[PDB]
Amino acid sequence: DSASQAEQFLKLVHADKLTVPVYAQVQQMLAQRFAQAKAPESKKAVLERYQAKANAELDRAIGWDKIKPELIKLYTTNFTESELKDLNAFYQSPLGKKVLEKMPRLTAESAQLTQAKLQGAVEPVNKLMADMDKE
Amino acid sequence: DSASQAEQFLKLVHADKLTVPVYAQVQQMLAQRFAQAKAPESKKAVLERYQAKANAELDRAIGWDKIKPELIKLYTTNFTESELKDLNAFYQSPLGKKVLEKMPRLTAESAQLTQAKLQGAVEPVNKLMADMDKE
Ligand SMILES: [Cl-]
């Protein structure tokens, strides 16, 4: 009931994409062990075969069908139904989507920036750290 | 005025506190350097008199007033006034404040749940990679 609300939520925020980075890392991991050994391109089809079987393997451990149920429980346990309705109402919005798509880049744009400002303080700190040592 | 919307936004999302880890952290390596040498208990003052220095050192580089400006710009850059009205309408709500408090634990729990389920495929994948060498 609200569980069909928690579904909605997980669809809407594209929770199933959460594994994308790991699938892709296991693709690379194979490409690695291919480029590592003899690399005859005429044998790309062997890289492709082992890159397909890993997928099925991963779908097995952490496929979205394996994950979803556990995720729903987490949201129901934590949000009321009315509470989920509004998250859906928000995340259905045009603004819902813009946000859902920018926020990453846009907190990684502030992090990446606050990290870069920090840089003008690491030496003067090192100096204060050497100055304490003297006493 | 778009600007007082973004301002309001950052306040609501407590983006000012993003730096908390970076202050405590430096004040965490000093305690560590005040004890990388002989660690007395009447010389507590010298650690503290040198921690007031590395505080205003960061305030020069990563003080709030040193990000806020360059920060509000980004949000107004990437959102219209009306949209900030609505983020603000959201994060003002009691649901906004809750979310803004659970999401970390909550995103961290789902990763913890998936990675667990991941393990159940490290070997099955190991075997695959191996089987690709025997080729
Ligand atoms: Cl909590």
Identify the residue whose tokens are 């603004």.
Answer: A95
d(C-alpha B46, C-alpha A43), whole Å: 67
CB distance B132–A99 less than 8 Å? no
Listed in sequence order, the residues at least 6 apart from B32 whose beta carbon sits closer than 8 Å to its beta carbon are none
Give how many domains chain A has, as a whole number: 1
User: B132 vs A46: CB contact, 8 Å cut-off?
Assistant: yes
CA A15 – CA A67 distance, rounded (Å): 10
What 3-state DSSP class applies to B99? helix
Residues 6 or more apart whose Cβ sits within 8 Å of residue B79:
A98, B6, B87
Distance B99 CA to ligand 1 centre (A): 9
Resolution (A): 2.9
- One-letter amino acid at B134 equals K
How far apart (Å, rounded) are the C-alpha atoms in residues B19 and B67?
A: 10
Place of tokens 């220095």: B53
SS (H, E, C) B46-88: HHHHCHHHHHHHHHHHHCHHHHHHHHHHHHHHHCCHHHHHHHH
The rounded distance, in Å, linking the Cα atoms of B2 and B83 is 10
User: How far is B70 from A110, CA to CA, in rounded Å?
Assistant: 9
Distance CA B48, CA A2 (A): 53
User: By what method was this entry solved?
Assistant: X-ray
- CA–CA distance from A77 to each of A83, B113, B134 (Å)? 11, 15, 48
Cα–Cα distance between B89 and B73 in angstroms, integer? 20
In the numeric block, which tokens belong to residue B70?
A: 């360059």
How far separated are the first and last CA of chain B, in Å rounded?
A: 66
Q: A-chain residues within 8 Å CB-CB of B106?
A: 74, 78
Q: B interface mutation test: which of A95, A113, A123, A127 has the most B CBs within 10 A? A: A95
Neighbours of B40 (CB within 10 A): 10
Long-range contacts of B37-44 (CB under 8 A, 24+ apart): B37/A133
Burial of B75 (0-12, 13-18, 19+ CB in 10 A): buried
**A5 Cα: distance to centroid of ligand 1 (angstroms):** 21
Domain hosting residue A102, numbered range:
1-135
